[PDB]
Amino acid sequence: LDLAALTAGAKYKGDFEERFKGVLKEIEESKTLIVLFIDEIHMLMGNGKDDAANILKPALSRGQLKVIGATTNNEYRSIVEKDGAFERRFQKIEVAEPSVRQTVAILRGLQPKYEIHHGVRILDSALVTAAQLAKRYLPYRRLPDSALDLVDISCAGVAV
Amino acid sequence: QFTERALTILTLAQKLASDHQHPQLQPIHILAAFIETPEDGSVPYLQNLIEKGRYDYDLFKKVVNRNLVRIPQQQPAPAEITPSYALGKVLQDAAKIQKQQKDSFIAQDHILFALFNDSSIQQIFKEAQVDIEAIKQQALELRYLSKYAIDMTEQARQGKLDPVIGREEEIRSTIRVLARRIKSNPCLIGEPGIGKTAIIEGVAQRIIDDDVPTILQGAKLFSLDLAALTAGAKYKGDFEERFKGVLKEIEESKTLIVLFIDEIHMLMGNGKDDAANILKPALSRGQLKVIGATTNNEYRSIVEKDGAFERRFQKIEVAEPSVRQTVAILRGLQPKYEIHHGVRILDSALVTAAQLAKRYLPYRRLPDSALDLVDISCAGVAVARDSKPEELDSKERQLQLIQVEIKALERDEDADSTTKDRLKLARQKEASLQEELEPLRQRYNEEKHGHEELTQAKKKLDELENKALDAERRYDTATAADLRYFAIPDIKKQIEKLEDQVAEEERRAGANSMIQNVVDSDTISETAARLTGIPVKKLSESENEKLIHMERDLSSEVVGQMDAIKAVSNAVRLSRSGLANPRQPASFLFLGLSGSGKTELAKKVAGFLFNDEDMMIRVDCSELSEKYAVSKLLGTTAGYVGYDEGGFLTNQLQYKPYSVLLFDEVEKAHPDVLTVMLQMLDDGRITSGQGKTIDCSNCIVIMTSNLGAEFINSQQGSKIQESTKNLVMGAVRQHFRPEFLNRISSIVIFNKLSRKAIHKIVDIRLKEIEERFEQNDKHYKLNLTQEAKDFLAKYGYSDDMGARPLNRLIQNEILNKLALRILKNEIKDKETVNVVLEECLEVLPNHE
Amino acid sequence: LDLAALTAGAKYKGDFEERFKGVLKEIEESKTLIVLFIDEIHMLMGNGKDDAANILKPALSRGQLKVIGATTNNEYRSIVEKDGAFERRFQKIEVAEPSVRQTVAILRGLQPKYEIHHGVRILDSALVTAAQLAKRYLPYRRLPDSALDLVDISCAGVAVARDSKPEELDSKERQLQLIQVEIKALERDEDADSTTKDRLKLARQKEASLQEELEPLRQRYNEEKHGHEELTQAKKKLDE
Amino acid sequence: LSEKYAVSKLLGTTAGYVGYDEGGFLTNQLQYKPYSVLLFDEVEKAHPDVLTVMLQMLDDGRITSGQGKTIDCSNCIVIMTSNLGAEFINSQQGSKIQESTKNLVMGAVRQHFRPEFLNRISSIVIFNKLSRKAIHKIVDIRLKEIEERFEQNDKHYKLNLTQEAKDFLAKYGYSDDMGARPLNRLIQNEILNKLALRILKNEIKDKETVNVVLEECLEVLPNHE
Amino acid sequence: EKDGAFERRFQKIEVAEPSVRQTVAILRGLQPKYEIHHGVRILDSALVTAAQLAKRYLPYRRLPDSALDLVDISCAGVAV
Ligand SMILES: Nc1ncnc2c1ncn2[C@@H]1O[C@H](COP(=O)(O)OP(=O)(O)OP(=O)(O)O)[C@@H](O)[C@H]1O
Ligand SMILES: Nc1ncnc2c1ncn2[C@@H]1O[C@H](COP(=O)(O)OP(=O)(O)OP(=O)(O)O)[C@@H](O)[C@H]1O
C-alpha cells in the first residue's frame, strides 16, 4: 500500500484521511487475513503520525489487519525516538547482508534474467568476481546490489 | 436483546409510568425517559437530534411534561399496569431498525426513531420532532479524544484487557493523588518498560471496579500524547492548538476525564517558548485530571530546567518487579498466553523467562522482556504446528514429484516400452507415501483438534469469567450467580474432559507433537538465544555445574597452571554459592613469571565465567604515580578536568558489571593506589569522582605480580614445589600489607612450564592464524618439523614474554614471506613450510 | 493572556503578532481599565527578542497597557539583563514567603474549600501542623503551597480512606455472594435432595449472619456518608 | 582529601570549572535525603581547611555548595572518626575511658583539629576497649546474624561455637591492638569457607555443624564428604 | 555590528543623561502635567528631593526615569 496511497492518488486537503480510512477499512475485513506493507517504509513517520495508531492498532484489535513494516537502522531509531508505540505494535527483525557465496548464489539464480535483460552472455565467474570486487572496492555499499549493478552496467555497456 | 443505553431508557420509561402513576406506559414516557434530566452528557436530550435539528430541548420537555400531566394519574393498583400495545409496536419497530442497521442489540437511537414516528407534537408552537432528515443526520454523527486518545476505562469495561498484577498500590497512589483539589495530577516516575502504563490499565480497572472515590468514580480514563505532541507539524503552535483543544474540551459535558500522558520528557517546553508542557500547568487547578509519566533521570532534569513541573505533578515512583514478582505477573498471564497462541506452557518456563530475561539484559527492562520472552517463545511453539505440513509435505512433495513423473511418463509411446513402463514402480512409491501420509495426516488432525477444543473451552471460560467479574463489580448478582451457578464450573469440567482428550500417552506426554509446549528452559533458553546470541548461560545448569564444566575446559586449555586454576575455581565456587559474603567480589593475586600466561588465565576465566575473553578490563600498574585518576576508577574529582571518570576501568565495569578486571604488575603500583586497592578488594561499593560507587560484585578482580618471578625461575617442579612457592609468597608477605592479603580471595601461584606443552600453544596459535583468514584457505603444508618447533620456541617464545615473540616470528618469517610471494603470483593455492637454519617458506609452485 | 493565547494559534510569522496586536487594539479602546496579566513572563521576548510582544508593547508604557506579570529569582535576572526595556516599564515587586502564622491563616481561609472538595473534615491543628511541617521539611517549595500540598494530600488520603470503607462491607458481601451463588449451585441440583449438598442450610445461616452485620454496617456507612455530604453541601451552600 | 574536595565531597563544582552535577557525594545526595546521617572515615587525615569546612554542617547547617546553594543540614547526625588519641585510649586503663586519659585524648584532637571546630561537636565520644569480657558476645552474635539470613536458610549452621572455637577467636580473632576485624575474616575464611568445601560439593541436605581443631583450625564433619 | 548599510543613511547621535539639577528642571517643566494628571499640588522641593534622592536610590534607572518615577508614583500615591 504505497505512493498513490501516500499522496499521488489524491489532491485535496483531507483526502488522506478519506483514502486512508477507506482502503484500510476495506482491507480490514472479509477478504482474507490481509497483511499490508509499505515500500517507502520509513514513511510511517508521515504516513502514520496522527494516525500512527489508526493505520493499524484498532484495525488489528477489531479483526486481523496486520502489516509488515521496515526501516533503515537510522530510521528505526527515529521512529522509536519519535513515537516508540511501534515497539508495542511491531516486532523488530534484523536483516542480514549475504556473504560472497550467498551473493553469488543470488546472482546465479538471476543470471538468466540478466542475460535476457541485455541479450548478453554472462560468465559464472563474473558473478563471483563481481561479488568479490564489489566488496573489495565498495565495501560500504550493499554487496548484492553493487555486484549486480556492476554486472547490469557492464552488460548495458557491451550491449551499446 | 437491548443495549445498556436502551435498557436505561426503557427502565426509565417504565419507571416514569409508575412515578407519575399512569394507566399505561406511552410514547410520552419514553420521550420523558430520554429526557432523564438535563445532564450535559444527555445524548438523547441536550445533545440530541431535535436541538441540533430544529427545536429547543427546553420547550420539547415542557410539551412532554404537559403530556405526562394529561395522561391521568391513578392509584398504585391501576398505576403503571403495562408497557402498552403502543410500545410493543415501537420497540418491535426499533428491532426492525436494528436489522436494517446490522446491529445485534437494540439501540436507544433506534427507539428514538421508532418512537418519534408514532408521536407528533402538532402544536402551532410545534415541537414535533424535526423530521427524519435532521434526526438521522444527527444520529449518524453521534460520537478531539477520538483522534488523539484511547478510552482505557471503556476498554476495561468491555473486558479484553490484561489484569494488572503487582501494581495495586501504585494504582491506588495515583487515585489518591487525583482526589486532590489542586495539583492533583500524579506522574509516574521510572524507566520505560517497567509497567508504568500497566498502572494506568490498572486504574482503568479500578474505575470499572468502582474502587475509585466517587469524585473520581464518575470520570473517564484516556491514554494520550504523541498524536498531539510529536506526530508532526507544519507550523508553530500545531501541537499547542491540539493541546488547547483537549485542555478545554475536557471541561464540557463529559463529567470529568482523567487523562494519561505517555512521556513528560517530550513535553518539557522548548526553552519554554510558549510551547508544549508550558500549557499543562495552566490547567493544574482547572480540572484536567491527568496522570503523567517520565523517567527518574529525565525527571530530575525536567524539573531543574522547568521549575514548575514538580508543583503540577506528583512524584509517584514505579520500579521493576523482582523476578518472583515478574513470575507472578507471568502466571496470571500464563493461560492467556496459552489461548493467545494455541499452545500449552510449563510454569517453569515463566520462572525461567523471568530469571533469564533479567540476567541477559543490562540495557532492558525485566517485565518487558519477560513478557516478550514468553510471548515469543510460546509463539514459537505455536509456529511449531508447522510439524504437520513439514512431515506431510516432505513426503507429499515427494509424492507429487512421483505423480509428475507418472503423468509425464504415462503420456508417451515409450510408456508402453519398459523404457518408461518401469514407471509402475513410481506408482508403488506414490501409493506407499499415500499410505504413510494418511495416518500421519489423521494423527495430525487429531492432535490439532485436541489442542483446538481445549483452547476453545478455555476461551469460553475466560469470557464467562469476564462476565462474572463484570457482574460482580457492577453488583449484578443475578448474572454473577448464574455464572458461578455451574456455568463456570461446567466449562471447567469441559476443559478437564478436554484434558482427558489430550490424553497424555506414556509415549507422548500430550497426544500432540504439533504443540511441543513451552518446555521449561529448553524452549525459553532457545528463544532467548535466538533473540540475543548463544551463551553458555542458555544451559539448564546450576552456577556450580556451569562453572565446573568450564573449569575442566579451562584446565585443559591453559598449559600447566592447574594449581592456579584450582585456587581460582575454589574461590569462584564459594562466591557463586552465595556463601562468600555478597558484598565482596572475588579477587586474586596471580603470582608467577612475566610471559607465564597469567593474563590469559584471567582472560579464560572471563572466557568462561562471563562467557567472553574480550570482556577483560586491564590496568597498567607500572605506569602509575600519586595522581591515579581517569586511567583507573576514580577519575579526577568532578570539578576538576577529567570528566571521563575512571575512563578506562570504571567505564568498562559499569557497562560490563559481569567481567574480570586486571591489575598488571600491581606490585609496582604507587602506595596510595595500593590503599585504594584495599578498598577495591572488598566492599564493592568503590568510590569515584562523581560520588557514584562501583558496587563490584560480579566482576572478578585479578591483580597480577612478578614479585616472586625469580623463585619460579628455579624450575623446582613443573608444578611449583615447597621452598619455591613459599618464597614467592614470602615476597608477597614482605611487599603487600597483610590487610590486602586478608581480603584477596586467594593468592594464586603459577608455574614455569617448558616447551613440552608450550609447543601445544604454538600449534594452537598456528591453527588460529591460518583458520582466521576469513576469505580463503591457502593452507600450509605445515612442515614445522622439529626445527620450527624449537625455532619458534627458541628465537621466539620467551620465558619473559611468552608467545608475544612467537607472534612476531610468525608475522615476519611466515606471513610477510607469504605476502611477498602472493604478490609475485607464486602461489596458486597452499604453501610449503621450509625451515632453514632461522626460518622461511618454500615456494610451492615453481615460481609460477 | 498567555501561552495558548499567544502561540497555540501561531503558525506563520505574523500569526502571533496578529493575535497579539488584535488584542492590544481592543484593550486600548473604549473598555474602561482593562488590566491584563501574565504568569511566567520568562516565556516572552525570546532569545534575541525578535519582538515576541516585548518590542511592540513598550509604546504603551506611556499609552496605558496595564499588565501584571510574574517571575522568579534568576530567570528574572536573566531576562532583565537581556531585555532592558520591560525592565524599566514595570515596578519590581519582591514577594516574600509569608510567615508560618500567615500560612496557617491561609490554610484556614482555604479549609472549607478542601473540606468541600474532598468531602472530609479537618482539625484546626491540622492547618497549624501543615504550615509548621512545611516550614521544617519542605525547603524547596515555599510555605503556602507546601503546606497546602500537605493539606490537599492529607485530605486526599482521607477521601480515599472514606471511599475504601466499602472494603469492610465487601469482605462481608464477598462472602455473602460466594454463599448465595454456591447455594444456587447446591440447591439447583439432584445432590440438593441428597444430604451431600444439604450443607446449603449452613450456607444460609451464614448469608443471614452476613446480612445481619451488613445491614447496620451499611446503615452506618450511609449515615456517615450523609454526615460528610450534609456538611459538605451545607458549607458549599453557605459559601454560595 | 585535599583542597580539591569538590563533587566527591562538599565544594562541588562552580561555574568556570569542569562538571555540572555537583556536590554529588555529600550535598547533592543530601539534597535528596530529607533527614540523614554522615560518616567521616579517618577524619584526622583530612585536609585542615576541610576540617573547618565541616563547621557549616556542624552547626547553622548552610553548606555552601559550588553553586551557592545549600542543603540546610538539620535533622541529621554526623559521625567523624579518628585515632589520634589512640595513644591514650590504648593506656588500657580499664574497659572504660578514664579521667586524664580522656583529657590527653582531647589534647590530641585539639592540637590537630581546630578546637574552634571540635568545641562545636555535640560530643566527643571515646570508644572503650572491649576485649574478651564482651568480645565473646560479638562472636556468635555476628555469626548467628550471618546464618539467620544465610541464603536459603535450610542448610544453615547450628552454632557450635564452643569455648575452643571462641578460644581460636580469642587468640587470633580478638586483635584488641589492631582491631577485631580478624573475627570477620575468620568467620569467612574458616567457617563459611571450610563448610563451603562440603556445601559446594552438594554433600548437605540441610542444617550444618562445625567442629574445632587446634594452630587454630576446623574439623571435617563426617556426616557429609 | 550586523548591518553597515543604515550607517550610511543615518547620523549617530548620543543622547546625554541630564544632571540631577537638569533633571529637576525637567521635573519642573512637567510639574503642571503632574498636578493636572492627578489633581494634586507638588512642592518644588519635592521635585528637588526626588531628583537627588532618586540618584541615590536607583542604580538601574537613569536620572530622568528615577525622578519621574518618584514624581508620578508619588502623585499616584497622593491620588489615592
Ligand atoms: N504488572 C503488570 N500487569 C500487567 N501487564 C503488565 C505489567 N507490567 C508490565 N505489563 C506489560 O508490559 C509492558 C511494559 O509496560 P510499560 O508501560 O512500562 O511500557 P511502556 O513504558 O509504555 O513502553 P511503550 O512506550 O513501547 O508503551 C506493557 O506492554 C504492559 O502491558
Ligand atoms: N602456561 C600457559 N598457558 C597458556 N598460555 C601461555 C602459557 N604460557 C605462555 N602463554 C602464552 O604467552 C603469552 C603470555 O602472556 P602474559 O600476559 O603472561 O604476558 P604478560 O606477562 O602479560 O606480558 P606481555 O603481554 O607484555 O608478554 C600469552 O599470549 C599466552 O598465550
Swiss-Prot record, chain B:
The keyword Flavoprotein does not apply. Its main location: cytoplasm. Changing residue 162 to K/W/Y: Impairs prion propagation. Disulfide bonds: none annotated. Changing residue 665 to Q: In HSP104(TRAP); completely abolishes ATP hydrolysis, but does not affect nucleotide binding, thus keeping HSP104 in an ATP-bound state. Residues 390-514 form a coiled coil. The modification Phosphoserine is found at residues 184, 284, 513. Residues 519-709 are annotated as: NBD2. Changing residue 477 to I: Reduces ATP hydrolysis by 50%. Alters bud morphology and causes septin mislocalization. Changing residue 682 to N: Impairs prion propagation, but does not affect thermotolerance. Induction: By heat stress dependent on the heat shock transcription factor HSF1 and the general stress transcription factors MSN2 and MSN4. Expressed at a higher level in respiring cells than in fermenting cells. Expressed in stationary phase cells and spores (at protein level). ATP 1 binds at residues 190-197. A motif (Nuclear localization signal) lies at residues 751-767. This is Heat shock protein 104. The lineage of its organism: Eukaryota, Fungi, Dikarya, Ascomycota, Saccharomycotina.
From Swiss-Prot, chain C:
Residues 1-166 are annotated as: NBD1. Induction: By heat stress dependent on the heat shock transcription factor HSF1 and the general stress transcription factors MSN2 and MSN4. Expressed at a higher level in respiring cells than in fermenting cells. Expressed in stationary phase cells and spores (at protein level). One of its GO terms (molecular function) is ATP binding. One of its GO terms (biological process) is trehalose metabolic process. Its main location: cytoplasm. Keywords: Acetylation, ATP-binding, Chaperone, Coiled coil, Cytoplasm, Isopeptide bond, Nucleotide-binding, Nucleus, Phosphoprotein, Repeat, Stress response, Ubl conjugation. The keyword Zinc does not apply. It comes from the Eukaryota. Changing residue 199 to M: Reduces ATPase activity by 80%. One of its GO terms (cellular component) is TRC complex. There is a cross-link at residue 197 (Glycyl lysine isopeptide (Lys-Gly) (interchain with G-Cter in ubiquitin)). It is found in: Cytoplasm; Nucleus. The modification Phosphoserine is found at residue 61. Changing residue 217 to R: Impairs prion propagation, but does not affect thermotolerance. Present with 32800 molecules/cell in log phase SD medium. Required, in concert with Hsp40 (YDJ1) and Hsp70 (SSA1) and small Hsps (HSP26), for the dissociation, resolubilization and refolding of aggregates of damaged proteins after heat or other environmental stresses. Extracts proteins from aggregates by unfolding and threading them in an ATP-dependent process through the axial channel of the protein hexamer, after which they can be refolded by components of the Hsp70/Hsp40 chaperone system. Substrate binding is ATP-dependent, and release of bound polypeptide is triggered by ATP hydrolysis. Belongs to the ClpA/ClpB family. Has 2 AAA ATPase type nucleotide-binding domains (NBDs) per monomer, a low-affinity, high-turnover site (NBD1) and a high-affinity site (NBD2) with a 300-fold slower rate of hydrolysis. There is allosteric regulation between the 2 sites. ATP binding to NBD1 triggers binding of polypeptides and stimulates ATP hydrolysis at NBD2. Nucleotide binding to NBD2 is crucial for oligomerization. This is Heat shock protein 104.
Swiss-Prot record, chain E:
Changing residue 9 to M: Reduces ATPase activity by 80%. Impairs oligomerization. It is found in: Cytoplasm; Nucleus. Induction: By heat stress dependent on the heat shock transcription factor HSF1 and the general stress transcription factors MSN2 and MSN4. Expressed at a higher level in respiring cells than in fermenting cells. Expressed in stationary phase cells and spores (at protein level). Required, in concert with Hsp40 (YDJ1) and Hsp70 (SSA1) and small Hsps (HSP26), for the dissociation, resolubilization and refolding of aggregates of damaged proteins after heat or other environmental stresses. Extracts proteins from aggregates by unfolding and threading them in an ATP-dependent process through the axial channel of the protein hexamer, after which they can be refolded by components of the Hsp70/Hsp40 chaperone system. Substrate binding is ATP-dependent, and release of bound polypeptide is triggered by ATP hydrolysis. Homohexamer, forming a ring with a central pore. The hexamer is stabilized by high protein concentrations and by ADP or ATP. Oligomerization influences ATP hydrolysis activity at NBD2. Interacts with YDJ1. Interacts (via C-terminal DDLD tetrapeptide) with CNS1, CPR7 and STI1 (via TPR repeats); under respiratory growth conditions. Present with 32800 molecules/cell in log phase SD medium. Belongs to the ClpA/ClpB family. This is Heat shock protein 104. The lineage of its organism: Eukaryota, Fungi, Dikarya, Ascomycota, Saccharomycotina.
